[PDB]
Scaffold this active site. Structure first.
Site, PDB file in Angstrom:
ATOM      1  N   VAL A   1       0.810  -1.103   0.068  1.00  0.00           N
ATOM      2  CA  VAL A   1      -0.191  -0.016  -0.206  1.00  0.00           C
ATOM      3  C   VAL A   1       0.917   1.226   0.067  1.00  0.00           C
ATOM      4  O   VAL A   1       0.301   2.212  -0.222  1.00  0.00           O
ATOM      5  CB  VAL A   1      -1.051  -0.041   1.306  1.00  0.00           C
ATOM      6  CG1 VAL A   1      -1.986  -1.033   1.240  1.00  0.00           C
ATOM      7  CG2 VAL A   1      -0.411   0.100   2.515  1.00  0.00           C
TER       8      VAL A   1
ATOM      9  N   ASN B   1      -7.213  -1.114   6.147  1.00  0.00           N
ATOM     10  CA  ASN B   1      -6.796  -1.690   7.222  1.00  0.00           C
ATOM     11  C   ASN B   1      -5.180  -2.053   7.417  1.00  0.00           C
ATOM     12  O   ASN B   1      -4.859  -2.451   8.622  1.00  0.00           O
ATOM     13  CB  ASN B   1      -7.639  -2.980   7.211  1.00  0.00           C
ATOM     14  CG  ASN B   1      -7.540  -4.093   8.301  1.00  0.00           C
ATOM     15  OD1 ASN B   1      -7.698  -4.170   9.435  1.00  0.00           O
ATOM     16  ND2 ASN B   1      -6.539  -5.023   8.076  1.00  0.00           N
TER      17      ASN B   1
ATOM     18  N   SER C   1      -6.776   4.051  15.521  1.00  0.00           N
ATOM     19  CA  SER C   1      -6.110   3.524  16.667  1.00  0.00           C
ATOM     20  C   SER C   1      -6.523   4.294  18.062  1.00  0.00           C
ATOM     21  O   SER C   1      -6.296   5.610  17.858  1.00  0.00           O
ATOM     22  CB  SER C   1      -5.017   2.963  16.674  1.00  0.00           C
ATOM     23  OG  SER C   1      -4.344   2.547  17.966  1.00  0.00           O
TER      24      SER C   1
ATOM     25  N   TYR D   1       3.356   5.671  15.096  1.00  0.00           N
ATOM     26  CA  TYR D   1       2.164   5.214  14.854  1.00  0.00           C
ATOM     27  C   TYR D   1       0.899   6.115  15.195  1.00  0.00           C
ATOM     28  O   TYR D   1      -0.041   6.260  14.501  1.00  0.00           O
ATOM     29  CB  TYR D   1       2.287   4.096  15.720  1.00  0.00           C
ATOM     30  CG  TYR D   1       0.786   3.221  15.640  1.00  0.00           C
ATOM     31  CD1 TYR D   1       0.796   2.116  14.363  1.00  0.00           C
ATOM     32  CD2 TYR D   1      -0.097   3.120  16.469  1.00  0.00           C
ATOM     33  CE1 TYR D   1      -0.162   1.023  14.586  1.00  0.00           C
ATOM     34  CE2 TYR D   1      -1.181   2.396  16.268  1.00  0.00           C
ATOM     35  CZ  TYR D   1      -1.140   1.300  15.148  1.00  0.00           C
ATOM     36  OH  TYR D   1      -2.473   0.417  15.267  1.00  0.00           O
ATOM     37  N   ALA D   2       1.277   7.116  16.397  1.00  0.00           N
ATOM     38  CA  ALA D   2       0.061   7.983  16.758  1.00  0.00           C
ATOM     39  C   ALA D   2       0.157   9.041  15.500  1.00  0.00           C
ATOM     40  O   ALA D   2      -1.101   9.335  15.299  1.00  0.00           O
ATOM     41  CB  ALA D   2       0.343   8.608  18.150  1.00  0.00           C
ATOM     42  N   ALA D   3       1.056   9.520  15.078  1.00  0.00           N
ATOM     43  CA  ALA D   3       1.068  10.379  14.060  1.00  0.00           C
ATOM     44  C   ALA D   3       0.355   9.984  12.915  1.00  0.00           C
ATOM     45  O   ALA D   3      -0.645  10.711  12.255  1.00  0.00           O
ATOM     46  CB  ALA D   3       2.430  10.885  13.834  1.00  0.00           C
TER      47      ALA D   3
ATOM     48  N   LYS E   1      -1.973   7.389  12.574  1.00  0.00           N
ATOM     49  CA  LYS E   1      -3.265   6.974  12.931  1.00  0.00           C
ATOM     50  C   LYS E   1      -4.121   8.268  13.220  1.00  0.00           C
ATOM     51  O   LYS E   1      -5.258   8.183  12.862  1.00  0.00           O
ATOM     52  CB  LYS E   1      -3.471   5.963  14.138  1.00  0.00           C
ATOM     53  CG  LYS E   1      -2.643   4.596  13.841  1.00  0.00           C
ATOM     54  CD  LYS E   1      -3.384   3.900  12.475  1.00  0.00           C
ATOM     55  CE  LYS E   1      -3.178   2.336  12.557  1.00  0.00           C
ATOM     56  NZ  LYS E   1      -3.949   1.850  11.328  1.00  0.00           N
TER      57      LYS E   1
HETATM   58  N1  LIG Z   1      -4.112  -5.159  16.994  1.00  0.00           N
HETATM   59  C1  LIG Z   1      -4.164  -3.938  17.682  1.00  0.00           C
HETATM   60  O1  LIG Z   1      -4.280  -4.234  18.943  1.00  0.00           O
HETATM   61  C2  LIG Z   1      -4.836  -2.856  16.791  1.00  0.00           C
HETATM   62  C3  LIG Z   1      -4.372  -2.734  15.669  1.00  0.00           C
HETATM   63  N2  LIG Z   1      -4.844  -1.722  14.919  1.00  0.00           N
HETATM   64  C4  LIG Z   1      -4.972  -1.622  13.392  1.00  0.00           C
HETATM   65  O2  LIG Z   1      -5.766  -2.325  12.731  1.00  0.00           O
HETATM   66  C5  LIG Z   1      -4.863  -3.092  11.751  1.00  0.00           C
HETATM   67  C6  LIG Z   1      -5.140  -4.537  11.024  1.00  0.00           C
HETATM   68  O3  LIG Z   1      -3.836  -4.788  12.338  1.00  0.00           O
HETATM   69  P1  LIG Z   1      -3.892  -6.387  12.835  1.00  0.00           P
HETATM   70  O4  LIG Z   1      -4.981  -7.119  12.375  1.00  0.00           O
HETATM   71  O5  LIG Z   1      -3.914  -6.148  14.372  1.00  0.00           O
HETATM   72  O6  LIG Z   1      -2.449  -6.826  12.576  1.00  0.00           O
HETATM   73  P2  LIG Z   1      -1.749  -7.840  11.546  1.00  0.00           P
HETATM   74  O7  LIG Z   1      -0.493  -7.926  11.709  1.00  0.00           O
HETATM   75  O8  LIG Z   1      -2.344  -9.295  11.977  1.00  0.00           O
HETATM   76  O9  LIG Z   1      -2.325  -7.637  10.320  1.00  0.00           O
HETATM   77  C7  LIG Z   1      -1.682  -6.643   9.411  1.00  0.00           C
HETATM   78  C8  LIG Z   1      -1.698  -7.038   7.832  1.00  0.00           C
HETATM   79  O10 LIG Z   1      -1.244  -5.831   7.243  1.00  0.00           O
HETATM   80  C9  LIG Z   1      -0.347  -6.471   6.187  1.00  0.00           C
HETATM   81  N3  LIG Z   1       0.612  -5.279   5.794  1.00  0.00           N
HETATM   82  C10 LIG Z   1       1.267  -4.562   6.269  1.00  0.00           C
HETATM   83  N4  LIG Z   1       2.252  -3.612   5.599  1.00  0.00           N
HETATM   84  C11 LIG Z   1       1.530  -3.777   4.353  1.00  0.00           C
HETATM   85  C12 LIG Z   1       1.802  -3.105   3.480  1.00  0.00           C
HETATM   86  N5  LIG Z   1       2.794  -2.083   3.224  1.00  0.00           N
HETATM   87  N6  LIG Z   1       1.135  -3.475   2.208  1.00  0.00           N
HETATM   88  C13 LIG Z   1      -0.029  -4.227   2.208  1.00  0.00           C
HETATM   89  N7  LIG Z   1      -0.094  -5.188   3.373  1.00  0.00           N
HETATM   90  C14 LIG Z   1       0.606  -4.657   4.451  1.00  0.00           C
HETATM   91  C15 LIG Z   1       0.283  -7.339   6.878  1.00  0.00           C
HETATM   92  O11 LIG Z   1       0.828  -8.194   5.885  1.00  0.00           O
HETATM   93  C16 LIG Z   1      -0.697  -8.120   7.602  1.00  0.00           C
HETATM   94  O12 LIG Z   1      -1.394  -9.068   7.058  1.00  0.00           O
HETATM   95  C17 LIG Z   1      -3.648  -2.068  11.558  1.00  0.00           C
HETATM   96  O13 LIG Z   1      -3.923  -0.908  10.716  1.00  0.00           O
HETATM   97  C18 LIG Z   1      -3.480  -1.701  12.952  1.00  0.00           C
HETATM   98  O14 LIG Z   1      -2.473  -0.547  12.874  1.00  0.00           O
HETATM   99  C19 LIG Z   1      -5.503  -0.328  15.565  1.00  0.00           C
HETATM  100  C20 LIG Z   1      -5.718  -0.428  17.002  1.00  0.00           C
HETATM  101  C21 LIG Z   1      -5.348  -1.623  17.583  1.00  0.00           C
END
Ligand SMILES: NC(=O)C1=CN([C@@H]2O[C@H](COP(=O)(O)OP(=O)(O)OC[C@H]3O[C@@H](n4cnc5c(N)ncnc54)[C@H](O)[C@@H]3O)[C@@H](O)[C@H]2O)C=CC1
Ligand SMILES: CC(=O)CC(=O)SCCNC(=O)CCNC(=O)[C@H](O)C(C)(C)COP(=O)(O)OP(=O)(O)OC[C@H]1O[C@@H](n2cnc3c(N)ncnc32)[C@H](O)[C@@H]1OP(=O)(O)O
Ligand SMILES: NC(=O)C1=CN([C@@H]2O[C@H](COP(=O)(O)OP(=O)(O)OC[C@H]3O[C@@H](n4cnc5c(N)ncnc54)[C@H](O)[C@@H]3O)[C@@H](O)[C@H]2O)C=CC1
Ligand SMILES: NC(=O)C1=CN([C@@H]2O[C@H](COP(=O)(O)OP(=O)(O)OC[C@H]3O[C@@H](n4cnc5c(N)ncnc54)[C@H](O)[C@@H]3O)[C@@H](O)[C@H]2O)C=CC1
Ligand SMILES: NC(=O)C1=CN([C@@H]2O[C@H](COP(=O)(O)OP(=O)(O)OC[C@H]3O[C@@H](n4cnc5c(N)ncnc54)[C@H](O)[C@@H]3O)[C@@H](O)[C@H]2O)C=CC1
Lengths: 242, 244, 242, 242
Positions: free
Chosen positions: C59, C85, C137, C150-152, C154
């Site tokens: 992305v 996401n 977030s 990350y805060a910046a 999000k």
């Molecule tokens: N797990 C948590 O506590 C929280 C997560 N979030 C957000 O929720 C979202 C999903 O995160 P999760 O499911 O927890 O983590 P995750 O690590 O399980 O999933 C993240 C996915 O994004 C993909 N990804 C990373 N960089 C990428 C890129 N440049 N291009 C395409 N895909 C990419 C990864 O390969 C992975 O499959 C994120 O935006 C995260 O910041 C927000 C608040 C809390």
């Protein structure tokens, strides 16, 4: 001086935050009226601070408030600043809270703010200038266990603040609120030493507020230095996590 | 004026014009040793001439090396840095449908990453002193969004996220970190719109006027002084109660 | 089915929250495209969930994003829903954070959202309908130690969300954000167990989020049941104190 | 059938948003109790929507509220969902607002929410499960000219919501609020057409809310799909600028 010749009514100013605000405002040149239900404390403030005026009021009593404002207007001919700082707590878990505990807090902390503001309004409107500062709380913004009533009132104060900012702007009047975090006054005095440390632990600065900190925010919002601040809730809470 | 900032050293980025320039003037009157740090050399020099006692040091806040040149110069000259105001900013407005990567990235670089560079650069001085004030300039566009400002809204909202993080991280070091969200204010940033749309943004302000640089400068002064010592992690709006 | 025949691109959907959202959306009748950089996880998702489509994307790479969207459009003729996401963390205290740590997180978590949204926009504008859901977030809304970058990003996502809600409303497009609290995925898997209990301690519900909880919020914001929700940050955080 | 066999009390459901929520909830399998003072409308709702139950209540009357809750418990054996949707306006500029107008609105829109929630609480606590949904307003969050009292009440509702989310979380109870924007009901009915257009002009979506939009948000917050949403104010306002 920042508040030179400005007449300021500060409700609840016989003690705590309000008392310190009275002193700060006097130092900045204001004519200060302490409006408080506590007569003994009010008289003590008069003795300790030559030039301060004390008028007894119950902010929950519309007649009492009417008399207060008439008295100030007769003495000084104007009312430039109102700080709605008087407040009480009657804490209880929701499951145990009585209607009396709920209503008492609404009467003082919400309706009282309505009474005082309505009473000063025609003076400020005639002047085409005024500052209204309403005291909310982090409990109003974030909620707090045991404080259904106080949270209702303090949040309600914010809703009124925002409404009045919109309504009164064309009259040359600024309306803002302060949300103090936990501050070292009598309101915190009866909380266990144990919960005090817990409260401090929620504050990244690692300390409770002092009355002077909150008084300083009242001063900012009462002075020309905040003339374009309107409808804002100014937090003075050390960055508390709540 | 009082002497609320007597002998305090304040770096104000973007202070050769507009809000920052007025803040420099107000801070000088309150006893501060003020460093205007701005990319615009000519404006910086003019500010020095018009305001005896002020110091100008050229900086590009988006350029980390430039930022370190600035901070090392201030430390060498004054021995301390008490206050940093991250006020420099640009706009590169465009509807989302037409916005270029360059327009997006340039605004992020100055308005978001630049705030990171300057804050990181001053931090060791403040930490050693056990005291400091950091004031970051956001915007009502950051808090509320605004048509044509995808990039500027991203940056200014991002500044708030950093402000809240830093308030948590740095409190133990005796440092306060807060943000200001000005409403629409009469500077060069606003002057580039038709007066017909000026009335529109004015119509959203119940006070019926735009902000003045002095209004915003007064909020910077509050947040830089001891009178805001228990204000931390807060976004102070100076926007006339704007409906947005 | 709430999403019958709707085409949804879910970035970062090879794992965690996004993967569960892909499954939830499929159950509600959507044609789901998992867009993720992790090819192995993407292919695993395809095998486990007959009917899901995987297209590799980074992305943060605009050309990669444009190929993704061209591919989806050529295949399905429309794009109804975009969920931004995908995200990463590269944590560090401010005093130690490198420019690379800061920039990488901005590139993926902020600029990547810009790339994806800009790329889908012409399709949604031409159809006069679309749903954009951006993942923020609680760290974006409240700050969090060790997460300057990350805060910046999000928080920046929220600024864009609000801007886009205003800009795109006239095009029949809704734009909203979700602020998850701490949720049980790989993103939390590396924190110490003592820290897990600290995170839970901040949540009055006494548990962390599940991927399904967040997926359920995505579903709400993607369906007709949220047609008058616009420019909103929907918190799914258990009432976390932060 | 997202609410299959769930018992829901919806206050103010004889008209407007609440009535539409009653219909939506029934469709989703709930046993719905409309609790309202308006007898003719309540009876009409029963005739028009077989399966719904109407029980007369004045939410500002604590005794009436307890009779309501006892009646529901005796008939259905449980109370799964409470929607505090009943509300009134008594608008006036601050300069002209009576104490009667102020207090009537507080009594219904704030204290009534307290009464109803207190009354259902022991049942939800016994079940170890429950959903409380409180209806606030964009006027509570943002202020609105002529609505000092309504803003006070609706903002106060948010204060209570946040407090209750904290107090009741570990009892398996979710507490959330909805802040509708301007919505086509009787509450907006006697607003001049010129003012209606002014309200629409503040909404980037260019329309007012429909009762179904708000009902859909109630459904989200009443269902398992929002189990990790707690202490949240869900805006359903079209992204209104206010
Ligand atoms: N797990 C948590 O506590 C929280 C997560 N979030 C957000 O929720 C979202 C999903 O995160 P999760 O499911 O927890 O983590 P995750 O690590 O399980 O999933 C993240 C996915 O994004 C993909 N990804 C990373 N960089 C990428 C890129 N440049 N291009 C395409 N895909 C990419 C990864 O390969 C992975 O499959 C994120 O935006 C995260 O910041 C927000 C608040 C809390
Ligand atoms: C806020 C701060 O912190 C400091 C600042 O940045 S100062 C002022 C903030 N900047 C702005 O508000 C945007 C200034 N620039 C513009 O408005 C220009 O329109 C633009 C450069 C963004 C786009 O230019 P453009 O491609 O020629 O589009 P343009 O024809 O001008 O406008 C298109 C529509 O969007 C609307 N629009 C544009 N900017 C808007 C805004 N800020 N708010 C609301 N509506 C807006 C216009 O009313 C116009 O409506 P119509 O289609 O019905 O006529
Ligand atoms: N101390 C704290 O932690 C916080 C306090 N606040 C608020 O700050 C304000 C000032 O309180 P404090 O200085 O802390 O406590 P305080 O007890 O020192 O002062 C409160 C004053 O209000 C007066 N008062 C109470 N009821 C009154 C009535 N009906 N009419 C007139 N006067 C009345 C009291 O007599 C007293 O002098 C209150 O509104 C309080 O709710 C808000 C957030 C935190
Ligand atoms: N004027 C307004 O309506 C509002 C302005 N703001 C913000 O207030 C701040 C001050 O802006 P204004 O005084 O209004 O505008 P301005 O244009 O008068 O001043 C901006 C200054 O920043 C400097 N600058 C730009 N890029 C720089 C860089 N890379 N390095 C160093 N200096 C740089 C400029 O040279 C200029 O002197 C900005 O952050 C702006 O985004 C926020 C809300 C409203
Ligand atoms: N229509 C709008 O624009 C907005 C409405 N709201 C809120 O949505 C809720 C529902 O209102 P609407 O459907 O729009 O209006 P409505 O007038 O159509 O329905 C309100 C219902 O509440 C009932 N009610 C009033 N006082 C009562 C009492 N003391 N005891 C029992 N029932 C009582 C009425 O009889 C009526 O059936 C209210 O809380 C209102 O404040 C909030 C934001 C916008």
């Amino acid at each position: 001086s920042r508040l030179q010749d400005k007449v300021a009514i500060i409700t609840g100013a016989a003690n705590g935050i309000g008392l310190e605000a009275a002193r700060v405002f006097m130092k900045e040149g204001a004519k200060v009226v302490i409006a408080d239900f506590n007569e003994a404390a009010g008289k003590e403030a008069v003795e300790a601070n030559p030039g301060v005026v004390f008028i007894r009021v119950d902010v929950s009593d519309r007649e009492s408030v009417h008399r207060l404002v008439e008295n100030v207007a007769e003495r000084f001919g104007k009312i430039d600043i109102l700080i709605n700082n008087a407040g009480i707590t009657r804490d209880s878990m929701l499951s145990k809270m009585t209607v009396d505990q709920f209503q008492q807090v609404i009467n003082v902390n919400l309706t009282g703010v309505f009474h005082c503001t309505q009473a000063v309004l025609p003076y400020m409107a005639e002047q085409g200038k005024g500052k209204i500062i309403n005291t909310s709380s982090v409990t109003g913004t974030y909620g707090n266990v045991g404080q259904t009533n106080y949270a209702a009132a303090k949040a309600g104060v914010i809703g009124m603040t925002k409404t009045w900012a919109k309504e009164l702007a064309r009259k040359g009047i600024n309306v803002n609120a302060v949300a103090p975090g936990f501050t070292e006054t009598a309101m915190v005095a009866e909380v266990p030493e144990k919960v005090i440390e817990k409260m401090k632990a929620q504050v990244p600065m690692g300390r409770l507020g002092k009355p002077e900190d909150i008084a300083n925010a009242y001063l900012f919002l009462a002075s020309h230095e905040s003339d374009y601040v309107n409808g804002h809730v100014l937090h003075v809470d050390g960055g508390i996590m709540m």
